[PDB]
Amino acid sequence: IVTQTMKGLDIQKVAGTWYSLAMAASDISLLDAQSAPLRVYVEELKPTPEGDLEILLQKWENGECAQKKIIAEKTKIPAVFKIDALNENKVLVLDTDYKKYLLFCMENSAEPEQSLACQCLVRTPEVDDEALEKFDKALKALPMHIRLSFNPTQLEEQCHI
Amino acid sequence: IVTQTMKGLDIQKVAGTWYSLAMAASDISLLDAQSAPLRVYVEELKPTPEGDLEILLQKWENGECAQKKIIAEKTKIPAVFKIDALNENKVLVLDTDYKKYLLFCMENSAEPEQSLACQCLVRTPEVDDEALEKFDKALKALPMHIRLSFNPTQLEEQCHI
Numbered sequence: 001i002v003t004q005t006m007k008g009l010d011i012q013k014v015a016g017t018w019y020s021l022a023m024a025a026s027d028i029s030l031l032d033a034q035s036a037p038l039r040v041y042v043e044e045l046k047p048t049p050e051g052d053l054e055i056l057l058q059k060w061e062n063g064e065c066a067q068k069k070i071i072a073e074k075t076k077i078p079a080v081f082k083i084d085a086l087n088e089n090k091v092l093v094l095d096t097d098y099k100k101y102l103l104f105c106m107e108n109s110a111e112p113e114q115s116l117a118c119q120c121l122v123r124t125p126e127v128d129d130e131a132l133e134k135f136d137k138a139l140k141a142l143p144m145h146i147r148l149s150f151n152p153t154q155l156e157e158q159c160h161i
Numbered sequence: 162i163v164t165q166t167m168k169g170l171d172i173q174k175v176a177g178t179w180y181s182l183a184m185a186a187s188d189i190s191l192l193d194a195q196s197a198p199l200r201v202y203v204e205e206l207k208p209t210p211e212g213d214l215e216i217l218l219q220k221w222e223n224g225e226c227a228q229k230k231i232i233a234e235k236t237k238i239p240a241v242f243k244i245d246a247l248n249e250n251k252v253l254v255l256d257t258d259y260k261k262y263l264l265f266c267m268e269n270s271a272e273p274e275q276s277l278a279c280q281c282l283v284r285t286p287e288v289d290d291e292a293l294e295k296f297d298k299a300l301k302a303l304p305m306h307i308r309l310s311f312n313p314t315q316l317e318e319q320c321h322i
């Protein structure tokens with residue numbers, strides 16, 4: 001159900017180092033335990049010359065932090081990509097300045113609170129209230145029910161432990 | 162570190178039925194799993210003639226919802242009570258109208274983000290954006306890192322399952 005998208009996105013310009021500052025989901029179970037489905041920690045974004053998106057992240061799987069590699073396929077809309085996987089999962093870029101934050105959402109393309117998850121990406125292991133403001137504003141319309149935030153020390157650890 | 166307290170509290174007037182609408186803690190681990198330390202669901206408040214506070218709640222203990230009974234001892238300040246337990250745990254009433262919401266916090270009396278947890282109590286199994294607004298406002302100053310919200314259907318279930 002996400003209604004915000006970044007106009008004139010330059011997907012080449014969001015490459016490099018990112019930290020998952022905060023996370024929010026429509027249902028508590030998507031982010032609840034350490035091995036929840038959308039409880040992922042993004043490490044780096046590597047956009048393909050063909051404007052695709054190679055995504056590096058950590059995800060707590062079977063009692064330990066495992067580095068993952070996912071591909072987001074480009075789409076006729078430049079802020080929306082499709083993850084190459086089952087049950088179709090769309091990735092929407094809401095807003096970014098490329099150099100400080102990146103607001104994106106994740107939705108099992110079925111409905112709003114159906115299966116929704118969003119994050120606040122920031123380039124540094126600092127908490128950025130500016131980015132978090134915008135993060136919560138953007139989500140204000142969304143049926144979010146769980147919301148995480150991490151501290152600098154946590155951001156420098158695998159799986160934010 | 163909580164800096165808001167309800168002036169002129171009438172602790173006799175907050176008795177009866179309450180629902181835990183939302184929860185927030187200074188550290189993710191206090192509310193994370195189903196059996197986290199401050200992941201409690203308040204059922205009813207029963208204030209003692211001697212202005213003490215008998216508290217009824219559910220808490221997921223050893224893989225199942227267990228009803229608990231805790232006593233909050235009155236204090237020289239009327240919005241602050243001490244739970245009869247170890248490691249001194251203070252309970253602060255931030256704000257209420259007795260008939261719709263009640264904002265309270267819980268702090269292992271050591272420091273702000275040390276061990277903090279707050280809730281948004283409401284009299285009905287309805288989501289009250291008014292109460293949730295005020296809830297988030299009050300917490301705006303607080304180092305909260307986890308935040309839960311529940312839906313009507315969940316509020317009518319034991320342990321909000």
Ligand SMILES: CCCCCCCCCCCCCCCC(=O)O
Pocket residue numbers: 014037038040042045053055059068069070083091093104106
């Ligand atoms: C511009 C895009 C930046 C944000 C990148 C989107 C993050 C990935 C979203 C889908 C992750 C896949 C679900 C968990 C991963 C896994 O289990 O392998």
Ligand SMILES: CCCCCCCCCCCCCCCC(=O)O
Pocket residue numbers: 175198199201203206214216220229230231244252254265267
């Ligand atoms: C006016 C006060 C209303 C709010 C009531 C405070 C709720 C209780 C706070 C402390 C709960 C004790 C911790 C978990 C309970 C247990 O393990 O038995």
